[PDB]
Enzyme design. Structure first.
Site, PDB file in Angstrom:
ATOM      1  N   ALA A  58       0.807  -1.229   0.000  1.00 50.66           N
ATOM      2  CA  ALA A  58       0.000   0.000   0.000  1.00 50.66           C
ATOM      3  C   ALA A  58       0.834   1.270   0.000  1.00 50.66           C
ATOM      4  O   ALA A  58       0.372   2.344  -0.400  1.00 50.66           O
ATOM      5  CB  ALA A  58      -0.916   0.020   1.201  1.00 50.66           C
ATOM      6  N   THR A  85       6.171   1.513   3.506  1.00 49.50           N
ATOM      7  CA  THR A  85       7.624   1.717   3.508  1.00 49.50           C
ATOM      8  C   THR A  85       7.975   3.040   2.851  1.00 49.50           C
ATOM      9  O   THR A  85       8.677   3.841   3.420  1.00 49.50           O
ATOM     10  CB  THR A  85       8.361   0.572   2.802  1.00 49.50           C
ATOM     11  OG1 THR A  85       8.023  -0.641   3.437  1.00 49.50           O
ATOM     12  CG2 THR A  85       9.822   0.754   2.848  1.00 49.50           C
ATOM     13  N   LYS A 126      11.584  -1.656  11.367  1.00 48.71           N
ATOM     14  CA  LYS A 126      10.723  -2.731  10.797  1.00 48.71           C
ATOM     15  C   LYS A 126      10.866  -3.991  11.676  1.00 48.71           C
ATOM     16  O   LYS A 126      11.568  -4.930  11.321  1.00 48.71           O
ATOM     17  CB  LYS A 126      11.131  -3.045   9.363  1.00 48.71           C
ATOM     18  CG  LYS A 126      10.301  -4.118   8.649  1.00 48.71           C
ATOM     19  CD  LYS A 126       8.969  -3.596   8.130  1.00 48.71           C
ATOM     20  CE  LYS A 126       8.210  -4.619   7.271  1.00 48.71           C
ATOM     21  NZ  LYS A 126       6.914  -4.071   6.693  1.00 48.71           N
ATOM     22  N   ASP A 161      12.462  -4.030   3.358  1.00 48.66           N
ATOM     23  CA  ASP A 161      12.099  -2.799   4.064  1.00 48.66           C
ATOM     24  C   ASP A 161      13.155  -2.438   5.149  1.00 48.66           C
ATOM     25  O   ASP A 161      13.555  -1.280   5.300  1.00 48.66           O
ATOM     26  CB  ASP A 161      10.743  -2.957   4.742  1.00 48.66           C
ATOM     27  CG  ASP A 161       9.636  -3.080   3.786  1.00 48.66           C
ATOM     28  OD1 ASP A 161       9.921  -3.085   2.572  1.00 48.66           O
ATOM     29  OD2 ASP A 161       8.473  -3.197   4.249  1.00 48.66           O
ATOM     30  N   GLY A 220       4.664  -1.615  10.581  1.00 52.88           N
ATOM     31  CA  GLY A 220       4.054  -2.922  10.775  1.00 52.88           C
ATOM     32  C   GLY A 220       4.334  -3.815   9.590  1.00 52.88           C
ATOM     33  O   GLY A 220       5.256  -3.572   8.829  1.00 52.88           O
TER      34      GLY A 220
HETATM   35  N1  LIG Z   1       4.283   7.687  -4.783  1.00 58.26           N
HETATM   36  C1  LIG Z   1       4.758   6.530  -5.318  1.00 58.26           C
HETATM   37  N2  LIG Z   1       5.262   6.493  -6.596  1.00 58.26           N
HETATM   38  C2  LIG Z   1       5.744   5.362  -7.166  1.00 58.26           C
HETATM   39  N3  LIG Z   1       5.751   4.184  -6.503  1.00 58.26           N
HETATM   40  C3  LIG Z   1       5.276   4.083  -5.217  1.00 58.26           C
HETATM   41  C4  LIG Z   1       4.738   5.267  -4.521  1.00 58.26           C
HETATM   42  N4  LIG Z   1       4.345   4.861  -3.281  1.00 58.26           N
HETATM   43  C5  LIG Z   1       4.615   3.528  -3.185  1.00 58.26           C
HETATM   44  N5  LIG Z   1       5.170   3.083  -4.341  1.00 58.26           N
HETATM   45  C6  LIG Z   1       5.618   1.712  -4.696  1.00 58.26           C
HETATM   46  O1  LIG Z   1       4.585   0.750  -4.447  1.00 58.26           O
HETATM   47  C7  LIG Z   1       5.155  -0.388  -3.802  1.00 58.26           C
HETATM   48  C8  LIG Z   1       4.571  -0.434  -2.392  1.00 58.26           C
HETATM   49  O2  LIG Z   1       5.522  -1.008  -1.485  1.00 58.26           O
HETATM   50  P1  LIG Z   1       5.860  -0.338  -0.046  1.00 58.26           P
HETATM   51  O3  LIG Z   1       6.266   1.155  -0.186  1.00 58.26           O
HETATM   52  O4  LIG Z   1       6.859  -1.314   0.586  1.00 58.26           O
HETATM   53  O5  LIG Z   1       4.358  -0.499   0.613  1.00 58.26           O
HETATM   54  P2  LIG Z   1       4.034  -1.446   1.895  1.00 58.26           P
HETATM   55  O6  LIG Z   1       5.173  -1.067   2.864  1.00 58.26           O
HETATM   56  O7  LIG Z   1       2.630  -1.058   2.409  1.00 58.26           O
HETATM   57  O8  LIG Z   1       4.216  -2.879   1.484  1.00 58.26           O
HETATM   58  C9  LIG Z   1       6.682  -0.214  -3.829  1.00 58.26           C
HETATM   59  O9  LIG Z   1       7.322  -0.882  -4.938  1.00 58.26           O
HETATM   60  C10 LIG Z   1       6.865   1.287  -3.921  1.00 58.26           C
HETATM   61  O10 LIG Z   1       8.082   1.652  -4.593  1.00 58.26           O
HETATM   62 MG   LIG Z   2       6.733  -2.266   3.412  1.00 56.82          MG
END
Ligand SMILES: Nc1ncnc2c1ncn2[C@@H]1O[C@H](COP(=O)(O)OP(=O)(O)O)[C@@H](O)[C@H]1O
Ligand SMILES: [Mg+2]
Ligand SMILES: Nc1ncnc2c1ncn2[C@@H]1O[C@H](COP(=O)(O)OP(=O)(O)O)[C@@H](O)[C@H]1O
Ligand SMILES: NCCCCCCCC(=O)O
Ligand SMILES: NCCCCCCCC(=O)O
Ligand SMILES: [Cl-]
Ligand SMILES: [Cl-]
Ligand SMILES: [Mg+2]
Lengths: 223, 221
Positions: free
Chosen positions: A15, A18, A39, A54, A121
């Site tokens: 979502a 990270t 983390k 992460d 989380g």
């Molecule tokens: N604003 C954004 N632009 C481009 N990619 C994004 C953006 N926000 C999140 N992502 C991408 O979407 C994916 C979500 O992973 P993450 O950030 O680890 O979310 P979560 O921690 O909830 O699993 C990642 O590959 C991240 O690079």
């Molecule tokens: Mg994550």
């Protein structure tokens, strides 16, 4: 000095927890607010092979504050299985249930030396950690503040509100922030209108993360 | 007759498919079952004839040939959005009337053993300024079948919904829409479901394995 603790969770896995965590930490640290990224529990990782988990991303940001830091210092329960931690634990480390009391001491410990301790989380709020506990339970035990990240797609309204319902039913401070991709033109016509409408009638407004760094820093440090 | 509301963890979860599979089973067992999609969005009926309503219509016609789209679906919009948003933009002068809808749905219980009602998207999806899909299902005094996807993340989604449902005065069941080729589910998610079920008085079932059970549920007093 006693520092503040922000738990970061999400509508679900993948979502933006990270990314948003980092963006927030980055902002805070730039404003002179000494912020570490943790983390504690992570799944779907193989630390022998790859260094893009992460915890790894966090480690490299954290090292700008404290270069002596290591992966094991900021992440404590780590599993190969791409699953809820409880399931991963039971299969990979049956004799070692996740200890949330331990985890709590450790996270709190960092509040001794950091202005703000950000805790990612795993997956969402109801993701089980132990037989008796889930991520929400954990966040409550930490007596932390909650930042819940939402995706920016069709279906976010339902997801946000489901999570709103659960959170508002518990004794904790929380904000729900939408992780809005820059190239997402559809969002402002498709979902945003209901969010605006929902905000006029709610004492806990849903914000857009990327436009709320200052506001969210404040929230995190309030007391 | 009896009324079963069908909702989901979210949109694109399997409401429509499962609804049809269940109706199919029921009708085969001599349980006269109609399929309704009262509110639908993201449709263009001039161009595309594959909307949920259309699929329902062709099933329903096996029972009553005279039936038409407008008989089983009442609020229909082009916009791919929550109905409230669609309504306000496309038909500002005509808020969705849940009292109307309720009459119309209940009406079908006069002539059908079972009336299956597909919602739109999930439970907290807003229909009017004051009301969402869950609200609607309560107003209908219907029973609730909540369909879940079968992927990584289903636990969270199931439990979130469980939490909301168990907080309200209605009978519900949560069914996982399990794809046949989904080998991963059995080792990734199923264990927690089993565990959850040992400790809950409202167990989570697997839809494809629960047709008879779900029919019973739907027709129970
Ligand atoms: N604003 C954004 N632009 C481009 N990619 C994004 C953006 N926000 C999140 N992502 C991408 O979407 C994916 C979500 O992973 P993450 O950030 O680890 O979310 P979560 O921690 O909830 O699993 C990642 O590959 C991240 O690079
Ligand atoms: Mg994550
Ligand atoms: N059990 C299943 N096996 C294979 N494909 C499915 C299954 N359930 C749904 N689908 C397909 O996936 C999509 C899900 O859409 P639908 O059933 O309308 O979801 P919803 O009604 O909740 O929006 C459809 O294209 C459908 O044909
Ligand atoms: N085409 C089906 C669209 C149904 C409404 C979308 C759900 C809105 C949301 O929860 O954000
Ligand atoms: N690496 C992300 C995987 C951990 C989250 C899994 C969530 C379990 C579920 O809610 O089904
Ligand atoms: Cl940085
Ligand atoms: Cl059929
Ligand atoms: Mg459908």
């Amino acid at each position: 000095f006693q520092g503040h603790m922000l738990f970061i969770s999400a509508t679900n896995t993948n979502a933006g927890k990270t990314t948003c965590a980092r963006l927030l930490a980055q902002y805070c640290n730039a404003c002179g607010v000494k912020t570490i990224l943790l983390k504690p529990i992570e799944t779907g990782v193989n630390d022998a092979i790859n260094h893009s988990s992460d915890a790894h991303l966090f480690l490299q940001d954290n090292r700008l504050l404290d270069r002596s830091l290591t992966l094991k210092d900021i992440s404590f329960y780590r599993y190969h299985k791409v699953s809820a931690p409880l399931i991963a634990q039971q299969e990979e480390d049956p004799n070692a249930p996740i200890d949330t009391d331990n985890l709590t001491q450790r996270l709190h410990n960092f509040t001794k030396t950091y202005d703000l301790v950000i805790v990612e989380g795993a997956g969402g709020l109801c993701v089980p950690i132990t037989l008796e506990e889930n991520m929400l339970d954990f966040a409550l035990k930490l007596k932390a503040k909650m930042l819940l990240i939402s995706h920016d797609n069709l279906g976010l309204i339902n997801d946000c509100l489901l999570n709103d319902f659960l959170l508002k039913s518990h004794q904790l401070d929380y904000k729900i922030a939408i992780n809005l991709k820059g190239n997402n033109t559809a969002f402002h016509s498709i979902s945003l209108p209901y969010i605006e409408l929902f905000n006029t009638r709610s004492n806990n407004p849903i914000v857009i993360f990327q436009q709320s760094l200052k506001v969210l820093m404040s929230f995190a440090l309030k007391g």
